From Swiss-Prot:
GO cellular component: extracellular region
Residues that, per the record, bind Ca(2+): 129, 131, 166, 170
Source organism of the structure: Dickeya chrysanthemi (Pectobacterium chrysanthemi)
Annotated disulfide bonds: 72-155, 329-352
Taxonomic classification: Bacteria, Pseudomonadati, Pseudomonadota, Gammaproteobacteria, Enterobacterales
UniProt-annotated catalytic positions: 218
Alphabetic keyword roster: Calcium, Disulfide bond, Lyase, Metal-binding, Secreted, Signal, Virulence
Protein's gene: pelC
Keyword Metal-binding set for record: yes
Pfam families: Pectate_lyase_4
Protein name: Pectate lyase C
Family membership: Belongs to the polysaccharide lyase 1 family. PLADES subfamily.
Amino acid sequence: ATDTGGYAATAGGNVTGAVSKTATSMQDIVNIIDAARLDANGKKVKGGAYPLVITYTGNEDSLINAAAANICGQWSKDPRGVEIKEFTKGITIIGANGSSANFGIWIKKSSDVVVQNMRIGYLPGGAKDGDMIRVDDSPNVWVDHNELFAANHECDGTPDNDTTFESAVDIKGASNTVTVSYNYIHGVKKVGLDGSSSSDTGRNITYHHNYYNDVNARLPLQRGGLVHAYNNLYTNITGSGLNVRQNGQALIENNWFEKAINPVTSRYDGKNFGTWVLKGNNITKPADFSTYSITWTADTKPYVNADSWTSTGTFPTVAYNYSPVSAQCVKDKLPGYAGVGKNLATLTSTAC
Ligand SMILES: [Ca+2]
């Protein structure tokens, strides 16, 4: 099946005639993908010659520990990452239990890509696009069960005062359908975009069963399109959460927000506010703002906050199938399903 629980419908590299390769390092992943471009004669096949399922068994904990030991030294270093450019045959990059990376995965102009069980933390090159996961012009991508972290901190002297670390799951271009699910994302300033700029609007993206903890902004920063956010556990949001902009429509349901500032908002442009449909969250009305430590701030430019906690628009009928658990259950159970080492386990009502 291609069931992801969201907009993306894909099995990645887990399809017929797929080649199974074990990568012991970042270079091993790079080499496997490059070999995968040639046929039996050594001639290049457009989009890849065959489907790939790469099991990453490398471990770069020394580097992640070193980066955590001096986080401000990260921005200036060379960014590291495995580019998955123009690979359309179906590819799955899955980390083995215990594997870790101090490099990110960069998906560009591809389709049918699955990234699972990868622990990516404290990446170098925040000043030069050292994203942890990047999806650009890539539809049918599944970013599932990964642990993406760093330090939710901004150092002084960084170019643009926004480059201490890069994003966790930036999505842009024609990544028409993407599902970001069961990821443990913590200690991350800029979590993820949905459109690199005001003009890059569109895409249908689903964020489900993600555990955001100690993150500052972009859960995501939506620009146009549709965003379906369900069963996500949003704790300790230091800046803003879902920022629905450029007339994007969101459906926020069965999520558990807590200790969050501006959890649902539309700010930073001053116009073209997006809309949201709120249903089944742990917060039902403003009265729960005190109960769940939900706080709101203003902005220098016109903005709209979900301080009334009422829907500001509508949402199309959800295409794919999904069965969401209660907000309380995500709060209870989700921390043991989200992330790596959970053997890609999913949260069902049976487990509530
Ligand atoms: Ca980025």
